[PDB]
Symmetry: D2
Subunit: 392 residues, 4 copies
């Protein structure tokens, strides 16, 4: 199959590229891959473990191997012998110039970038480069996945976002003020009839205009925002307190990381998309809102080794309060990269099975799942198991 990756040279994207190839050459286990659990046997009939990559980037380096080695140099999150083995394959992967349109102040923190909007292109001219890049790569087994730096909350507009006819009116009128890059790549992929997922809290295809386009074109799509570590624990453990009829009176979630993700998120406008996504799950699960605080801070020594400190204060019998603390220490790229490969395969499955529009049953992968109030990790895992069985 083919995966077009937005933000192709990022750490999640390149680790997924590295892992795909290492697994295919026989030199790495299949750990981490949900699509490889026993419940999903038979998936290889529809979406075999077999990948070619392309993508869009704004940080142009020469190819995906150079990009993979840069992140590896700082992180050493897989073995040198893997990097060497997949070098040749990755050196053949060369990203194309994307758009950082309205992606917030945090993009400054990436250093040397080049973008389509920086060439003076109108929105319509931009959309055409993007589509030309994707379609020249795409086949009948291609999916597009956004792994780009998180954008800030967009300037929402009813006219331009609330219908597909209004969204295309935006493009025709070149009204950039209301377009963000994640929407343009989503639009390009759905217009081309490719399945799409959004791994980030950017809006992507999560506006009605693009949901309406997905249904009309008969294309499945999924999102938003990879739920990979601290928020995974949150949607696993919060349920325990409800099962036992306990009130959660406060939940603190404090995250510190470095590398390119922590750097963009060091900016206040970019940080807000991610924080809101992480914060808001509590109410949806419990029915009420405990005093929550969720923060992300840059901490460069940690590089991609994001660490999360959480504290949960909660009331039990007779009203007495009590305390639970947890600390999560993981490489972000390691818990996210297999999910990119899972999402790609499940999208292809859903595509081959006639599924259109939001695949709400992929909520399990995401912090902010489209079209569903199923947040609980256990329930999400049941829904995804059952969804697959119903279509298999």
């Amino acid at each position: 199959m083919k995966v077009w990756l937005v933000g192709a040279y990022g750490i999640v994207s390149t680790t997924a590229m590295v892992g795909a190839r290492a697994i295919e050459r026989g030199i790495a286990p299949k750990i981490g891959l949900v699509s490889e659990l026993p419940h999903f046997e038979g998936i290889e009939k529809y979406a075999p473990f077999s990948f070619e990559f392309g993508g869009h980037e704004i940080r142009l380096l020469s190819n995906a191997y150079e990009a993979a080695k840069e992140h590896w140099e700082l992180n050493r999150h897989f073995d040198r012998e893997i990097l060497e083995a997949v070098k040749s394959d990755l050196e053949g992967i060369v990203a194309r110039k994307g758009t950082a349109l309205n992606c917030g102040s945090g993009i400054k923190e990436l250093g040397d970038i080049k973008t389509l909007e920086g060439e003076g292109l109108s929105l319509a001219e931009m959309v055409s480069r993007i589509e030309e890049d994707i379609k020249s790569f795409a086949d009948d087994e291609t999916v597009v996945i956004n792994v780009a730096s998180t954008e800030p909350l967009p300037n929402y507009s009813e006219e331009y976002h609330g219908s597909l006819e209004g969204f295309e009116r935006m493009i025709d009128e070149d009204r950039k003020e209301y377009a963000s890059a994640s929407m343009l790549y989503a639009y390009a992929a759905l217009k081309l009839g490719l399945p799409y997922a959004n791994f980030t809290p950017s809006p992507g295809s999560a506006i009605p205009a693009l949901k309406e386009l997905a249904e009309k074109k008969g294309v499945p799509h999924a999102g938003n925002d990879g739920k990979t570590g601290e928020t995974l624990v949150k949607t696993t453990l919060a349920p325990m307190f409800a099962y036992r009829n306990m009130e959660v009176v406060g939940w603190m979630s404090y995250n510190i990381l470095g590398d390119y993700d922590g750097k963009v998120l060091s900016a206040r406008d970019n940080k807000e998309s991610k924080v809101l996504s992480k914060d808001k799950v509590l109410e949806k699960m419990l029915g009420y809102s405990p005093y929550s605080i969720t923060e992300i801070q840059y901490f460069p020594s940690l590089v991609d080794n994001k660490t999360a400190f959480d504290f949960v204060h909660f009331k039990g019998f007779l009203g007495k309060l009590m305390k639970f603390y947890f600390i999560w220490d993981a490489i972000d790229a390691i818990v996210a990269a297999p999910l990119i490969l899972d999402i790609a395969r499940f999208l292809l499955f859903a595509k081959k099975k006639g599924v259109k529009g939001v695949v709400k049953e992929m909520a399990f992968f995401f912090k902010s799942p489209m079209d569903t109030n199923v947040i609980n990790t256990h329930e999400q895992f049941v829904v995804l198991k059952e969804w697959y069985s119903n279509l298999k």
Copy 2:
């Protein structure tokens, strides 16, 4: 309804007594009570929030109020104004002299005790005092719940434990070597046709002899071992790692507490029942055994404020290892006492609905659930919800 409590003067038992009454007088919330969740509406038709207490003890103090105040003095785990309000009610609760038969070396740590076996009674003569105590209290809405100090692993015997006819042959032959107190109280309650639950890792009714008696007499029973804090988190979080296709390579669980429970468990023979119960859940959920360590140590300054430190080392994509840590800080009596009241009400429900034998669907309350391989907290909560709906 009536609850006969084995270990009536313990902290869990007295906190439950205090809480029952405080709730009934209107001065405490219903937090902590599973049986008060919205899914279980209508339960009050079969098991209203309404309790009278009695029980067996070996530490004879004058009454349940003196016993409640002693634990309160050290713990202050509810307000003085609650203690004052429920004083009169508790002063009417007076335990009867039980048996500490073969309850292990740790019983020395309780100080001044008096027991039936210490009076020279045969097993048959013991069983008769126990039954006479219980039946003089019991009505058609009575349940017996074991909350006594944890016993060591028993000397298991096929003849004497593997059939009801062999168990009664033990009693007739006065073969004490093979009887433990928890089995004698279980036997007494089931012989009398009362529902029984075991809140501790002692054997209780979890031997075939007594399971066979429960079916024959048509009595429901449940157990074993309240799953209340660290093991609750364990059966909630371990699933997350399986959902994501991660290998758990080691799990450490280190617990330190004081008061009467930590004191009995300071003994190596008594400690083993509890440790095995806490340890063994991992395999049952995951399919394989990570390197696990589970310890309990006395730490007197903590009194009933058991604190648990856990560390989970686990492999993800590409085999890279990663770390999760958690610390649990709660009053044991506070997370256990509402469950005693829940178990009592659910037993009465099950009784009134024609249920006999092990109520496997009460696994949610227990670390070592009888007759079931459902360990996962989420699944256990679904089974209990569904069980109730099917009988309501």
Copy 3:
């Protein structure tokens, strides 16, 4: 002796009042009191354990007992029987109306307040009420200690703060823009010849104008900012890494609390004084600056039970990095209140021994010690021991 307390109805101030009296009535141990360590035997010759209180407040409640009970109701940080025992004594303590001049936006969070500036008084008229209040209370064994809500960083001015003649020119010209309440109370106390300490990161007497006045008047003074929990651990543990020739590459300090202190500090202008004070100690001890982050967030369920999460990332032999984590769980009022009593006694000692100006050797009590680069807790404790011996 007498202690005039600025912020008399706060939690630290009232807990110190409660504790003083409980100790004097014989019903509480002397734990927590540095001045009661064996090295300081003989101090009772100069500063016996014997206290009368008065003070300034802007939250006017009826008396110090009402104020003590309000904090106790939420915190229960000492026993009911103590509160009852010291009730009569505290009911005789009635604060006088102070000034919240330029104390930042966070003062809104205290609710109902009344202030001298709110009466239209000029600076000179304000200074006169303050001095009249203090002098009508003061004797030859009186000290004034600021325990008021933390102010923001002041508008610093060379003319008005850099000399005593320029500071009094400010008062004569009624130039409020450049005066903050903490400076006015410091000025009032030093003008009256009373020793002064500042327990907060407000400026207080830490401007040259007031240091010059302290020397001229021959009055000892100390500050700034009680070092009581997380920053105490910081100045104790950071040294370990230097002793062992390790580079600290990052130190995160994340604090969450509620009650009146967390509420005022929830405001960004007020928060900054405290954060800078907590943050800046690292460089002073180590010689260089690790990447540090220090945050304070409101978390109301915790009330005065401030909890601190810290993480220290550090390099060792061969450059390999490594991790230390700590979590501090304490009642702020409990670790601060005995130090108020210690500071008062040590000030009186220093006064009776002819000491004038900044008592730099009291650095041990403070996060931002005036006139000293001795930050290390061990060194600070040696300096204070030696200082006392040299004057005893």
Copy 4:
């Protein structure tokens, strides 16, 4: 200089070998080396950074490079490029066959071993091989350092250990029952006039017989037991509580590690030396004994990445209790290896400066310092600074 290392192929020993050479070839920083702090400038006049190695082992592998690579393969605690750079140097280091005489049951856990006692040699014949090995290597700038697996507590004997004349009577009588390997290597080194340090809690030279021999021969010696991580924090932080007049009511120290050290310590007899050494520091610093628990457990996934969980429960003002928690995550070999090089250089310094007998002023390096009640890390660091200045 030369360092003879007992347990030459262990992880601490080989990491120190690797580091020495990497530093000398210019490719690693001097971080971790106390002897490289600015206070110790001029030490290179007496003990330059310049090392040749030899040693005794019972696990015979071909040479020190093979041994270094085995630990590296599991731990990756320095870079591959370092291992490659120092390969040739280490391949020239070949250990000689030592003695595991009375080293406890845990030695079984090392797998394939060969020993002098296994050849049938008497004690006197053993002592002669050891001395012949050491003296054929030794020069006027040689030191012997024990880094061997921890032994159990020895069978102490007044006759055979309480005097040098009684110790040699043991050797003459071939009374093995009373000799342990660590004493034999200590004896061999001091008889040969070499300085000796003991990095482990084995007895080594810490018996009067050998202390008396050190004085008589005029040889300096130091020990016992590298204080490197959790116990370093303990002797740094415990003082804070005394400085502030707080009672420590309980301290739990729970350690889990794997590799060869955790494996030997998995045995109950070997574990006890280390646990007692770690536990007993509290009383010596504070004056009294808090309820302490100190445990070490094998946890193989962690290899040499020992992790320590500690909890400190302590009383403050008014008697209110409060909690501090810490977690230490470090590679044991990384915090210990530079200290071997420091100890060697400081021993040579002390030797060249006429120092004889126990160098009590090296207590800073050790958990159980000989001939001193100075336990506090700060005081220990002052003593070592001052000692060096006095002799420089």
